[PDB]
């Protein structure tokens, strides 16, 4: 569930 | 920023808005000198659809308040000359998530444009200390950014607590700031922005850089930020600031 706070965000399944 | 409120005009003169070609605002940054900004490294990683690492793709808006009024009095546009992402930045773990942005034309200090103080490499922002997070990011997860600059008060979190809340995801370069209850937190679009700490003399020092989180404003999921003192020497040797 980890996502950077950018646009677009960089997200991972965890 | 989730759970914040409209900031007063010129209340955060060090807050910078970074736009990329045809995307408007997508990341934040902090003014630290006439020629330099601090931001997050992840903002400038290339995607197979856009060259975010290319400095020519960026425009920095200083003294900006309303994203729908970028030609307002006091607002300064500046091009980027160079982007220095930290050598140890990990694009998977987000470790060492910090970058330095060199402007092409010097920023002009005004009532709306003003640098933030940098804390010493030995200073410590204690757990429980009230901090301010600011930005034009989402005001709720899955929402849209804010037109008006938002501000929110959050709390520095004990590192051991941080580690237990986000198991196997936290390094010494990172810091949890927010509330265990959620409600107030940084969100998408806030990345790269500074944490503002009102110190003993009333002056505001940068306490961190908006980095990542497990969602936004969720319970037991405080926002994660890059620490500032740890990189005070890295900033100096690269910028002279
Ligand atoms: S510490 C960086 C900012 N410095 C200044 O604005 C200095 C301007 C003149 N040298 C002066 O007024 O002395 C700063 O103060 N940042 C935090 C803040 O609250 O302003």
Author numbering:
A (entry chain I): 1 to 14
B (entry chain A): 16 to 60, 60A, 60B, 60C, 60D, 60E, 60F, 60G, ...
Excerpt from the paper describing this PDB structure:
Matriptase is a type II transmembrane serine protease that is found on the surfaces of epithelial cells and certain cancer cells. Matriptase has been implicated in the degradation of certain extracellular matrix components as well as the activation of various cellular proteins and proteases, including hepatocyte growth factor and urokinase. Matriptase activity is down-regulated by its physiological inhibitor, hepatocyte growth factor activator inhibitor-1 (HAI-1). Sunflower trypsin inhibitor-1 (SFTI-1), a cyclic peptide inhibitor originally isolated from sunflower seeds, exhibits potent inhibitory activity toward matriptase.
The crystal structure of β-matriptase-N164Q in complex with SFTI-1 was solved at 2.0 Å. In this structure, SFTI-1 forms a bicyclic structure where two antiparallel β-strands are constrained by a disulfide bond between Cys3 and Cys11. The cyclic peptidic inhibitor docks onto matriptase's P4-P2' specificity sites with good shape and charge complementarity. The SFTI-1 scissile bond (Lys5-Ser6) is in close proximity to the catalytic residue Ser195 where the Ser195 hydroxyl group hydrogen bonds with the main-chain amide of Ser6 and makes close contacts with the backbone carbonyl and amide of Lys5 (2.9Å and 3.0 Å respectively). The side chain oxygen atom of Ser195 is also in close contact with the carbonyl carbon of P1 residue (Lys5) (2.6 Å) at an angle of 88.6° (Lys5O-C-Ser195OG), suggesting the protease is in an active conformation capable of initiating bond scission. Furthermore, His57 is suitably oriented to interact with Ser195 to support catalysis (at 2.6 Å and with Ser195CB-OG-His57NE2 angle of 101.4°). These observations support that SFTI-1 functions as a substrate variant of matriptase in a similar manner to other BBIs. In the structure, the S2 subsite of matriptase is occupied by SFTI-1 Thr4 with Thr4 side chain flanked by His57 and Phe99. Comparing to the benzamidine-bound structure, we observed that the benzyl ring of Phe99 undergoes a rotation to widen the pocket to better accommodate the P2 residue. More importantly, the guanidinium group of Arg2 forms cation-π interactions with both phenylalanines as well as Trp215 in T-shaped geometries and provides further stabilization.
